[PDB]
Amino acid sequence: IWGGFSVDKATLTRFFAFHFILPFIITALAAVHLLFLHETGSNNPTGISSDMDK
Amino acid sequence: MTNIRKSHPLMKIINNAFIDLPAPSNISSWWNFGSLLGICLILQILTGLFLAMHYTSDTTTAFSSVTHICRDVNYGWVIRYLHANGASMFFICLFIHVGRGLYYGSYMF
Amino acid sequence: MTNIRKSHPLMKIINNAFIDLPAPSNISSWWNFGSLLGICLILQILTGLFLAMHYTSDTTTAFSSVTHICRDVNYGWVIRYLHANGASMFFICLFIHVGRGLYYGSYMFLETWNIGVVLLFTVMATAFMGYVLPWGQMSFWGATVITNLLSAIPYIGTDLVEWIWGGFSVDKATLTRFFAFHFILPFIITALAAVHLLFLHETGSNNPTGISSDMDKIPFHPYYTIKDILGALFMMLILLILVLFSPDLLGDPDNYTPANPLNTPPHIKPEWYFLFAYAILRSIPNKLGGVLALVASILILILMPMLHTSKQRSMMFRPLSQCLFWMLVADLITLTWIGGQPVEHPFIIIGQLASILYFLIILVLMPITSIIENNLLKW
Amino acid sequence: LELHAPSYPWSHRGLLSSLDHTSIRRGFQVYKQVCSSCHSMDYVAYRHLVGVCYTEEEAKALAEEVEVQDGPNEDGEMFMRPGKLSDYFPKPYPNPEAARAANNGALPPDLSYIVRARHGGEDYVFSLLTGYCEPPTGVSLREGLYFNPYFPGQAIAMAPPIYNEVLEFDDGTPATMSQVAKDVCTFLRWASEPEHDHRKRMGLKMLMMMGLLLPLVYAMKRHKWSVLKSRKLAYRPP
Amino acid sequence: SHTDIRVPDFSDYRRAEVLDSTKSSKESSDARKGFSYLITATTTVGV
Amino acid sequence: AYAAKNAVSQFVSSMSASADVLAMSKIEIKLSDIPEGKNMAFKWRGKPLF
Amino acid sequence: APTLTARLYSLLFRRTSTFALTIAVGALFFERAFDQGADAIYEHINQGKLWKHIKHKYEN
Amino acid sequence: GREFGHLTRMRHVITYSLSPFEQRAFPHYFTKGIPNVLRRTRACILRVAPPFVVFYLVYTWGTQEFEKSKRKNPAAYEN
Amino acid sequence: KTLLHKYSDIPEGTECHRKAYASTSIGGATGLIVSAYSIALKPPASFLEGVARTGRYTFTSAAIGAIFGLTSCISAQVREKPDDPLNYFIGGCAGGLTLGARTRSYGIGAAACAYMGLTAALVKMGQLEGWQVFAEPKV
Amino acid sequence: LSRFLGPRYRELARNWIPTASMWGAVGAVGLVWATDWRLILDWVPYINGKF
Amino acid sequence: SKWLEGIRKWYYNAAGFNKLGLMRDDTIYEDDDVKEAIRRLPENLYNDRVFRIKRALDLTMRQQILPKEQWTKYEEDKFYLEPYLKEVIRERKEREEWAKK
Amino acid sequence: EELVDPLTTVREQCEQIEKCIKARERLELCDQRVSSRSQTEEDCTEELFDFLHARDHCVAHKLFNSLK
Ligand code: HEC
Ligand code: HEM
Ligand code: HEM
Ligand code: HEM
Ligand code: HEM
C-alpha cells in the first residue's frame, strides 16, 4: 500500500488516484442500493407496512 | 399514444425511481438524509473535480498546489472549503442515516 | 422456488443483458467489435488507474513522471504501452463498428445510434486530452493547434479558448485540467455505454441480412459469450503484438522530447485516429469553415438515418450501395494519409477532393443510388 | 530536402533479438569518455547498469569516479560527494543557457531518449556520426557549423565527434569510427528502451501462449456452435 | 403426420466412434466427453 | 436563480485564468542586453516573443 | 478397454472439483515447464549476447 | 418485453439438432472450408477491391509528385 | 499507331495509371475492330443487338488491356525490375483470367492465361532484344 | 415535411407562435442575465449601474 | 422494355436474396407499415415467409448459399406483400390527409 | 598503424557500383556547372543526396559484417 518503506510520494499519488476513482464506485453502489430498496419500498416511522397509505 | 414518462425506457426508469415511486406518507425528516447523502456525493464529486484541475499530486507540489487553489485560483477557497466541510456533512448524514435505519428497524431490508 | 438468476434483481438484469438475451443466430464477426470496445474501455480504465498512481500533472514533473513509469515502475512499460496502443485499438474498433452500423443499417436504431455518436465524441475528447498528458513536444503543440481552432467561433472563440486553456496559452493549468477531464470522462463513457445497451436491448440486434430474426433467436450465453471471448483473445493478440514487438509503431517519436513552447516540432500532426478530421479541416481554407466541416464529419452520422432511402435495411442485398460504401472507406483512408502528409501541391488537392467526396458519398450519391436500386427491384 | 538513413542490420532488429550487452558496455565507455562532455543522460543512473553491462561493484566504482553535488550541510552550503549508484549520470552543463553558450548557441540534446526521439532511431544516429562530409559545392556553412548530410538542414553545430582511436575500449576491440558509432548507438538504444530484451522475451512467451490458446478457444467455440451449424430445419406445412 | 418424417442423416458430421448405428454410444461416451473436456481444461490452464 | 447563477459563475471563474497567470500577463524586457543584429526570444503569454 | 481420454474423463474431468484440481496442478506445472522452455528458447536465440552469458568474464 | 416465449409466432417448422459431443467440431474444415472461402472472396472482390486499387494509384501518384516537386529545376539556374 | 506510341512512351514501371489507360485504349480499339468484323460477317438481328455485341466485345477487350497494363506496371514497380519479361507474363495471365471471367468459363481462363502470358513475355523479350515481327527488306 | 403541410398545421403554428416567442424572450433574458452581456445590459437602466 | 428488364434481372442476380432462397418482399425493412402488412398476410403466406427467412438466416450463419438449382428465379419471384403494403400506405395517406385539413 | 576503418573500404567498394558511378558523374557535372557560374544560387546537395543514398545503401548491407 505504501509503495515503499514508508509513506511517501508513491503513497500520495496512489491515494490521489484511488480518491478520484472511489466516489464513482460509490455512485454505482448507490444505484444498486436504490434498486434493492425499490424492491421492498421504504419503511415508515411506525414500522408497519404502508401499502394502504402511499 | 402513450405517456412518454411511462413509455420511454430511460424516462420509465427515472419515473419509477423518483417521480411516481410509491412512498409512505408518514416518512419523517429522518428519511430526508439519504437524498442529502446523494446531494453531498454530487457536490463532493463536482468540487473535487474542480479542485483536481488545480491540484498536483507530487510531494514537492501538493501543499503549494492547495495554497495556489486557496489564494490564486478564482473562488478556489470556496471550492476547497466546500469540499472539506462537505466531507464532514457527508459523514454526519451517514451517521444519522444509519441511526435511522437502526432505530426504525430498516435493516430488515 | 425460483431460479436466482431470473428472480434476483441484479442477477435478473445481468441475465437479461448477457445470459438469456435473444440474439440473432446469423450475427457475423463484425458483431464482435462492440464487445471488444467494452473490453477496451475496461482495459483502458484499469491500465490508466495503475498509470495515474505514478503520474503527476505538473509541467515540471509530467515528462519525468512518464519516464519514471517507463524505466523504474515495475512492469510500468507494459502498462504505459498497453494504454497507448489500446487507445489505437479502441479507435480501430470504434471505426469498424461505425462501418458495421452504416453497412447493415443499424443506424435505424435511432436512440442507440445517437448515443453511440455521443460516445464517439466523448472518446475522441478523452484521447485528445490524454495525449497532452505526457507533455511531449507533440502533446503541447497539437494541443495548441487543436484548441486554437475554437478561437474561430465568432465573438466567443477567444474567451472560450482562454477559458479552456486556463490562461493565455497552453500551460500547467491546461495540463492539470486535462488530467482531471481525462480521468473523469471514461466513466461518463461507461454510463453512456450502459444507456447504449439499454436502447439496443429495447429493439434487439440487427442481423447481417437486415431482416427481422425473431424466428432465429439463439441464447447469448452458450453461443455469443464464447464467440466474444474468442474475438477478445484475437484483439489481445493484436494489441500485445503492438505492445511487445512494435511499442512505438503508432506513435510519433517527437513526443519523447520534452515540450519546448519556444520551438515547434518539424511536423505538427495529430494522432492517427484524428488525422481524417485534420485533413478535412485543412481542406477548407477559412478557419471557421474548417472547424464547422470537422464538426460535420462526425455529426453527419446523425443525419444517416434520415438519408436512408433504400427499401432494404442492409447493404448485403444492395451491390451499388456496397460499391459506394467501399469508396467511402477508401476515401477515409486517403483522408488519414493526407492528414499525415505535409501541406503541399500534391496533397492539398487530393485532400480537398477527398473531403468533397466524403460528404458527397454520404449525402447525395448514396441516397440516389438507393432510389435507383429501389426502381431496379420494382419496389 | 532530407536523406533518409539506411537501415543497417543491427543485431537487435530481429523480432526476438536482444541487444548485445558487450556493445552496450562499450557504448557506455564511448558515452562517458566522448559524449558526456557536451550531451547529457538525465534519465539513466548507474544503478541501471548493474545487471545490463556492468556488475554492481563495477557500477559503484564507476559512480565513485564522478563527483556529485550533495544536499546542503549543517552550515547550509552544498558539498561535493564521491558519487553513488543511485545518482544519475552527471549533467555536463549547469543550465541549458550555459550549454548553449559553450556550444555556439546550440543546446546538445539529451541522449536518454535520443534514439526514440529522432526518426530513423539508431540508424539516424549512426549515419549522422559516420556521415560527416565536406560541404557540397554551392553550399556555404556559417561559422561554427559543420556539414552533415543526414542532419536536417545539413548544418550541425557538432563537430565530427568520432574519429579512429577516439577512445580505447577495455575489451580491446579496435577503436575504429564505425565500431565506436555502433557501440554508442547500441548503448543509446538501451537507454531509450531499457526494457528491450524483457519486451522481446515477453513477446516470445505471448506468441507461444496465443498460438496455444487461440486454436483451443476456437475449438471450444466450434464445439458449442456445432449444434447450430449442423441444425437441419424442415418446413412441414399441413 | 408425425410418422412420415425421419431425422435427417448426420453421418457426415458424426464422430467416428458414433458413426455405426449398431453400436452402443455409452461405450465411447467417456472418450468423447474426455476429449472435449480436455480441450476445455487445457484452455483453462493457459488462461 | 440568483444563488445558482452565483455558484455556476464561481466554478466557471475557477476554471478561468488564475492570479499568477494574469500577473504574468505583462512582461518587462530589458533592452541593451540584446546586442545589435540579434533577436532575443522571450516567453511572454506562453508564446515566443521576438 | 477404456482409452486414455476416457480414463482422464472418469478419473478427473467428470466431477468439476477434480476437474479444477487437474486445472490448478496443471497450471502450476505448466507455468514451470513453459517458462523454462521459452526462456531456454530465447537464450539460445540470443546466445552470447545476454548479460547472463557474459557475466562471468567480468565478475570476480 | 423481448423474451424467448413471446418473440414471434411460427408454425410447422421442425428443427433437428445433434449433441455437440456426438459431432465433430471441425467437419471437413479444409475440404469444404477453402472452396467456400474462395467463393465468398470471388463474390466480394469485384465490389470491394476497385476502390482500394484507386487508393493505391492515388497514393503512388501523390508520393511521386511530391518527390518531383522537391527536385531541382534546371531552368531556374539557366542564366 | 498513336495509341501504340502512347503505350511505349510511358516508361515501363512508371505512371501505372497512364500505362493502364493506354492499354485500355488499345484493347478498346481491337474490340471495336473485332465487333465491326463480327457485325459484317455474322449479321445482328437488330441495331440494339449489334450495339450489345459491340459493347460486349469492346468491354472484354478493354478490360483485358486495362488488367494487363495495370498488373504489368504494378508488378514492375513492386519488384522494381523494369525490363523483366515476367511482369509482362503476369499481366498477360491476368488478362487471360479476365477473358475467362467475361466468358464465364474456367477453361477459357486457364488456356488464355497460359497462351496470352507467354505471348506478352515474348513481346517484352522482343522489345528488349530488338526482334522484328515485320522486317524492312535489307537482304 | 409532406405530412405537416396543411391548413390545420398553419393554424397550429399561429396558435403556438405567441408561446414560442415568449419562451424565446425568456432564453434571451436568461442568456444576457447569466452571461452579464454588457452590450445588451448597458441599455437597461438600473442594471446599467453594474458597469 | 426488354432493356429495362435485362438491367433489372442483372440487379436481381447481383443482389443475393435469390441465392438464399428469399423473395424480394422477404427482404423489405420492417417499418410500421410493413409490420401491419405482415400482420394482414394470409396464414399460408406468413408461414412461407417465416420459413424462408429462417432458412436464409441459417444459411448466412454458416456462410453458405443455397444450391444454384434452388435459387429463386427472377420470373417466379412473387410480390406477395406489395398489395397489402400498398393498401396500408393508402390508409396512412388518407389519415394524414384528413389530419392536414 | 592506421587501423583502416571498414567504412573507408566499404564506401570505396560501393563507389565502384553502377548507381554510385552514375550518381557521382551527375554530381561532378553539377559541380562544374555551379563552380563556373559567378553568382548562381544553385547547389549540388541533391546530386550528393542521390550519390550518398546509393553508396550508403550498399554500405548498409556490407559494413556491419566487418564490425565485430
Ligand atoms: C561537444 C564537445 C560535443 C560532444 C563531445 C558530442 N556532441 Fe553531440 N552535439 C553537440 C552539439 C553542440 C550538438 C547540436 C548540433 C545541432 O544543431 O543539432 C550536438 C548534436 C548531436 C546530435 C543531434 C541530435 C538532434 O538534435 O537531432 C546527436 C545525435 C549527437 N550530438 C550525438 C553525439 C554522440 C553519439 C557523441 C559522442 C559518441 C556526441 N554527440 C558528442 C556537441 C557535442
Ligand atoms: C453514499 C452512501 C449512501 C447513499 C447515497 C444512500 C442513499 C439512500 C437513499 C436515497 C435511500 C432512500 C431512503 C432515504 O432517503 O432515507 C436509502 C435508504 C436506506 N439506506 Fe442507503 N445510502 C447510503 C449509505 C447507507 C448506509 C451506510 C447504510 C447502512 C449501513 C444504508 C442503509 C439504508 C437503509 C436500511 C435504507 C432503508 C431506508 C428506509 O427504510 O426507507 N445506506 N439510502
Ligand atoms: C465522494 C466523496 C468524497 C469525499 C468524502 C472526499 C473527501 C475529501 C477530503 C476529506 C479531503 C481533504 C480536505 C482538505 O483539503 O483538508 C479531500 C480532498 C480532495 N478531494 Fe475529495 N472527497 C470526495 C470526492 C472527491 C472526488 C470525486 C474527487 C475528484 C477529483 C475529489 C478530489 C479531491 C482533491 C483533488 C482533493 C485535494 C484538494 C484539497 O486538498 O483541497 N474528491 N477529499
Ligand atoms: C467506447 C465506444 C463504444 C463501445 C464500448 C460500444 C459498444 C457496443 C457494444 C458492446 C455493442 C453490442 C455488440 C455489437 O453489436 O457488436 C454495440 C452496438 C452498436 N454500437 Fe457501439 N460502442 C461504441 C461506440 C460506438 C460508435 C462510435 C457507434 C457509431 C458511430 C456505435 C454504434 C453502435 C450500433 C449502431 C450498434 C448496434 C449494432 C447492431 O445492432 O448490430 N457504437 N456497441
Ligand atoms: C478509452 C479510454 C482511454 C483512452 C482511449 C486513452 C488514451 C490515451 C493515450 C493515446 C495516451 C498517450 C500514450 C502515450 O503518448 O504514450 C494516454 C496517456 C495516459 N492516460 Fe489515457 N486513455 C484512456 C483512459 C485513461 C484512464 C481511465 C486513465 C486513468 C484512470 C488514463 C490515464 C493516462 C495516463 C496516466 C497517461 C500517461 C501515459 C504516458 O505518458 O505514457 N487514461 N491515454
PDB file of C-alpha atoms in Angstrom, chain A residues 8-9 12-13 16 19-20 23-24 26-27 30 34 37-38 40-47 50 53-54, chain B residues 16-18 21-28 31 41 45 49 52 55 57-59 62 83 104-106 109:
ATOM      1  CA  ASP A   8       5.949   8.944   0.510  1.00  0.00           C
ATOM      2  CA  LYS A   9       5.402  10.327  -2.994  1.00  0.00           C
ATOM      3  CA  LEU A  12       0.331  10.338  -2.171  1.00  0.00           C
ATOM      4  CA  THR A  13      -0.078   9.694  -5.900  1.00  0.00           C
ATOM      5  CA  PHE A  16      -4.997  10.740  -5.281  1.00  0.00           C
ATOM      6  CA  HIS A  19      -9.599   9.024  -4.087  1.00  0.00           C
ATOM      7  CA  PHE A  20     -10.580  10.113  -7.588  1.00  0.00           C
ATOM      8  CA  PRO A  23     -16.569   8.144  -5.431  1.00  0.00           C
ATOM      9  CA  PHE A  24     -17.776   6.891  -8.825  1.00  0.00           C
ATOM     10  CA  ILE A  26     -19.889   4.791  -4.637  1.00  0.00           C
ATOM     11  CA  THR A  27     -22.210   6.380  -7.203  1.00  0.00           C
ATOM     12  CA  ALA A  30     -25.854   3.820  -4.552  1.00  0.00           C
ATOM     13  CA  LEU A  34     -31.844   2.156  -4.628  1.00  0.00           C
ATOM     14  CA  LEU A  37     -34.770  -0.556  -1.708  1.00  0.00           C
ATOM     15  CA  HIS A  38     -37.316  -0.134  -4.504  1.00  0.00           C
ATOM     16  CA  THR A  40     -39.041  -3.582  -0.822  1.00  0.00           C
ATOM     17  CA  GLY A  41     -40.194   0.030  -0.733  1.00  0.00           C
ATOM     18  CA  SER A  42     -39.417   2.377   2.128  1.00  0.00           C
ATOM     19  CA  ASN A  43     -40.049   1.664   5.784  1.00  0.00           C
ATOM     20  CA  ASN A  44     -42.170   4.055   7.832  1.00  0.00           C
ATOM     21  CA  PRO A  45     -41.507   5.538  11.277  1.00  0.00           C
ATOM     22  CA  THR A  46     -44.209   3.250  12.685  1.00  0.00           C
ATOM     23  CA  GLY A  47     -42.587   0.166  11.174  1.00  0.00           C
ATOM     24  CA  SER A  50     -47.816   1.232   4.400  1.00  0.00           C
ATOM     25  CA  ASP A  53     -51.338   4.658   2.632  1.00  0.00           C
ATOM     26  CA  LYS A  54     -48.992   5.509  -0.248  1.00  0.00           C
TER      27      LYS A  54
ATOM     28  CA  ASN B  16     -40.375   4.676 -11.416  1.00  0.00           C
ATOM     29  CA  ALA B  17     -37.305   5.551  -9.348  1.00  0.00           C
ATOM     30  CA  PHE B  18     -38.098   9.138  -8.389  1.00  0.00           C
ATOM     31  CA  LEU B  21     -42.383   5.761  -6.764  1.00  0.00           C
ATOM     32  CA  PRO B  22     -44.898   4.568  -4.147  1.00  0.00           C
ATOM     33  CA  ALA B  23     -43.789   6.259  -0.957  1.00  0.00           C
ATOM     34  CA  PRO B  24     -45.030   6.002   2.634  1.00  0.00           C
ATOM     35  CA  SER B  25     -46.838   9.228   3.616  1.00  0.00           C
ATOM     36  CA  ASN B  26     -45.518   9.221   7.199  1.00  0.00           C
ATOM     37  CA  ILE B  27     -41.770   9.004   6.487  1.00  0.00           C
ATOM     38  CA  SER B  28     -40.320  11.790   8.603  1.00  0.00           C
ATOM     39  CA  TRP B  31     -35.780   9.840   5.849  1.00  0.00           C
ATOM     40  CA  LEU B  41     -21.994  12.893  -3.174  1.00  0.00           C
ATOM     41  CA  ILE B  45     -17.655  14.992  -6.938  1.00  0.00           C
ATOM     42  CA  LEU B  49     -13.136  17.629  -9.893  1.00  0.00           C
ATOM     43  CA  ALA B  52      -8.290  18.339  -9.208  1.00  0.00           C
ATOM     44  CA  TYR B  55      -4.041  20.045  -7.713  1.00  0.00           C
ATOM     45  CA  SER B  57      -0.056  15.098  -6.549  1.00  0.00           C
ATOM     46  CA  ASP B  58       3.738  15.287  -6.379  1.00  0.00           C
ATOM     47  CA  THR B  59       5.028  15.583  -2.826  1.00  0.00           C
ATOM     48  CA  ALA B  62       0.897  19.194  -3.340  1.00  0.00           C
ATOM     49  CA  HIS B  83     -15.085  20.044  -0.281  1.00  0.00           C
ATOM     50  CA  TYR B 104     -36.703   2.212  12.844  1.00  0.00           C
ATOM     51  CA  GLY B 105     -35.612  -1.328  12.007  1.00  0.00           C
ATOM     52  CA  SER B 106     -34.794  -0.521   8.392  1.00  0.00           C
ATOM     53  CA  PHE B 109     -34.151  -4.803   4.138  1.00  0.00           C
TER      54      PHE B 109
END
